[PDB]
Structures are given as structure tokens and as C-alpha cells.
Symmetry: C3
Subunit: 184 residues, 3 copies
Amino acid sequence: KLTLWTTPDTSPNCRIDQDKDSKLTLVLTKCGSQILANVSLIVVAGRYKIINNNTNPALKGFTIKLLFDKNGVLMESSNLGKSYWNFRNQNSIMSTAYEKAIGFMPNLVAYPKPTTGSKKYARDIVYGNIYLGGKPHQPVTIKTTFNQETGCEYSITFDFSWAKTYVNVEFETTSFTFSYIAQE
Amino acid sequence: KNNDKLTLWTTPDTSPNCRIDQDKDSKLTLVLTKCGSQILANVSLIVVAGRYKIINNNTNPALKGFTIKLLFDKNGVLMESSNLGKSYWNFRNQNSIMSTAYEKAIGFMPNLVAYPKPTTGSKKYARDIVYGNIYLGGKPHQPVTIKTTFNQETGCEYSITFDFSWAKTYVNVEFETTSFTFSYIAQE
Amino acid sequence: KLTLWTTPDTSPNCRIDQDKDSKLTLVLTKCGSQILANVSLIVVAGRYKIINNNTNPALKGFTIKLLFDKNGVLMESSNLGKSYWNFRNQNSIMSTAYEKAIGFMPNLVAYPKPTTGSKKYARDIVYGNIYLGGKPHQPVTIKTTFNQETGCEYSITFDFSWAKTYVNVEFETTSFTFSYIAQE
């Protein structure tokens, strides 16, 4: 169907450091040649759950990677658990594994895989801000990069970073919308 | 027939449809376009009259925001108690609306699993918020924050709240804004 | 078709200062009443390829204009080349010029053409930020304005501007998504 998502409940589905330490809520809606993407993050456990830059002054970011094979199937090496990622069915997911989602993959001409000696253009990046706890003075950068991972046919990489000293701040975010050019 | 039941909108005209401070003091231009599981939302605000038409933070140093609330019942019907007026909030027909008031728009409502109503002692997650910026008079040095919150209002089944705020001293600045696009997860 | 675009390749298609000095990657996807727009810019040659505000302290922006006739056909006077602008076919364009794209045009009631004595509202503008070289400390403002150009029925204008002193910074950008209300 036209929506590939994580069920948007708060049940953990993602490993940043350890199994099920986070809930990535990602919704990809196919509008023909463009994927409309909506993303938020809740860290439920482990070193990123509560940021304390007094205790850890160098703790300033982390990465969640979605790696896809040539059929647009999520690879086990992804931070997002494979069992949680599927076409929408009501407020859940299809009960059976999808076989193909190439129509949701980032376009390889728009966003080529990195090669040695190739001119690397920034158009495979989208920057956004999201806010911890919905507080306007707790921005974090969410940088989304398309097809820059090795060992896959396609990738969506979320780099989360911050440039303020956050003390005892739960890492759970507002939402950000972006789009990207679809492979087909 | 030209009924577009994949668009719930305030027509794109500049006819006032909203009360911030007084009846019909503003045009909230809000277009909700259903792209299946996601609503693509486009918003701007024109304050046409009343206290918030012209911001003067010399005269009113504490005036740094205001709120527009859309409250919906269980059928996604806008409640009369909302800031937004009901009469031209409807499914699209060309540059106007469907000839009768809609009875159901649950497909345009913010998803209650994604954006649960608050209950006493409930863990509040921020993912029911989207932040954006719009600019007064289209001037790059006149930013205002538009914070959109889903389903956080009491006495309704769904809600979309727009909190406008600014963090600069605006002196004799007309409150009429650039547009901002966001999306949210649809209830169905 | 539901996508009007520049192919997603890096082949120059746009004149900022001189013919083919830039690749504007612009994808307009019709989602009913709204056009979902995705934009990035690569300057490949001429005065805007490498910004040096030490040498050129007044170089703080430039404009790319798409002018359309009453049928939503791109006019030759546009910065974007006409041969590069068409309905999608896979990763390329239809080989034959489109005759009608009014469904992709910015709504004239939402975004009226300027007239003397008529109140000009800012809602025909969307602001965004993109980043030169994908570097978070190299923001540029991309201001998009609907239907404000003379000598056309519809227009999309991209005003690029910056306030920072950029020294030897290549003008090639991250991507930005916005939407606008469609004429029909």
C-alpha cells in the first residue's frame, strides 16, 4: 500500500546502543515520485534516555540507520527492528513481511551511493530541528542522509546532534516532516 | 461533480474566519490534504482587525503570543467553541466548499495512538508537537514561532492547537504571515 | 502525470548568471489540492559557484524564476531551461513538451498576482533554510514566492540569500521540502 511505517504507539522498536532502547516513529507515505516522511524519537533505555552533559560533556549525538536491500526490504544490520517495519494496516502493520518497497526507496540518481573520486553533493541531506520534551529551548538537529551507507542498496540515516549542555533531559522529541525523491 | 473529499480547508480567500481576541479578527488559511496515512497541512495567518492586527511591544512589552484552537468531536466535526469559525471549514469544491457541512472527517483527525489525549498522571511525549517558523510581512527579520499540537485539548475527541509566539520587540508590525507546511499521522 | 520535475541528475539546467551555470533540482508532486515541492541547487560555474564575501562583500544572494503561461507551461524567460522541465518518466522526462499543467500552478486566490491598490499578503511566501556543502554552520535562506512575477500567469520565485561572511564556500545545497495550494 501507500504507507510504510512503524506503528505509532510507544512500544520500543529500535537499538541505538542496546536492543529496544528506543521507539523510532517513522511514517513514509508515497505521493508518486516523492515520499512524505514524518519522524520522531523516544529513547526508553540506555545511555541516550536521559542526557546529562554535566556528567558526559562530550555526549552530543547518535545515529539511527535504515539499510535496505535491492527490494527495499529492511536489513537486519539496521538500528530499526525488522519486525516493526511494514505497510500500514489500520493503526498497526500488515501481519506478514512485505516482499517489495522499491517505490519507497531514496532515488539513486538523486542520491547516489558514495564512490572514491565521485563529486559528493549535499542534496542527499535534509536538516531539521526537533525539540526535547517539546521545549522550544531544547533543540536538537536531525540530519537525514539518503543512500550514504555501505553494505546495502539504499539507506536512510538519521544523525541526531545537539550543541547545548542538556542536564537530566529525557531524549524524546517533537516531530519533523521532510520528503525525498523516490527510486520509482 | 467537483467535491474534493481529500481536502479539508478554509477556502484560500482572505474572508475572516477566526477569532483570536474578537469575532472575525483573523483569516486562518488552513489546508489539510489527505495523502493516505498522513495529512499534509499548510497554514498562514492574517490578523485583519482587533488588538493583534498591529503588534507594538513598546506599548505592550508582555505581548509575545496568542493561540488558535480547532476542537473536534468524535466525527472530526469542528466544535463552535473553537477559535476557527465553522461556516467555511469544509471539504473543498474548487476554490470554495462542499454545499453542506460535513458529518464525518475522521480521515483528517490527528491519530490518537500517535497523539493520545492527556489523562491524569499520563506520560506526555512531545511527538504530538511540530514547531515551525513564519515571518510577519514576509520579512526575514520578523520570525514568529508557530507551535502545532495534536489532541492535547480537554472537552473534545481531537484537537489542532496553533500557539504563536515571538522573541523580538515588534513595533507597529502587522500580524500577517508567510506560510508553513507540516504533516501529521491521520486517525484513519 | 502527477510529477512535474527536473530529472534528478546533476546535468546543469539553469542560469543564475550564465546559461547552464547551475542544476536546480525541483520536483513538484501533485497531492490533490497541494503541490509537494522538493528543491536543491548546485552551482557548477560562474560568479556564484564559489562565494567569497572577502572579495565580494555585497554578494549575498541571487534569484531563480519559473514563469508560467495560462496553461502552466514554463516560459523561455525563466532561469530554468524549458528542455529540462516536464512530466516524469522513470528517472527522465516525457520526450514531448507538456501542453497543460494548471493542476501544478500556485492557486491565484491563495496567491494573487500583484495589483496597485490591492493588499499584498505574505502568505504567498514560504521561507526555508538549506546548508552549503551540508555543513550545519553554512545556512542560506531559500525564500519561495508564488505568482509575484510580471509577464506571466503564474510564477515560482526562489530568492537565495545569506547574512554570514562565506569565504571560498561552494554553492551546492541540502534539500528543502515545502508545499503550496494548487490552482485546480
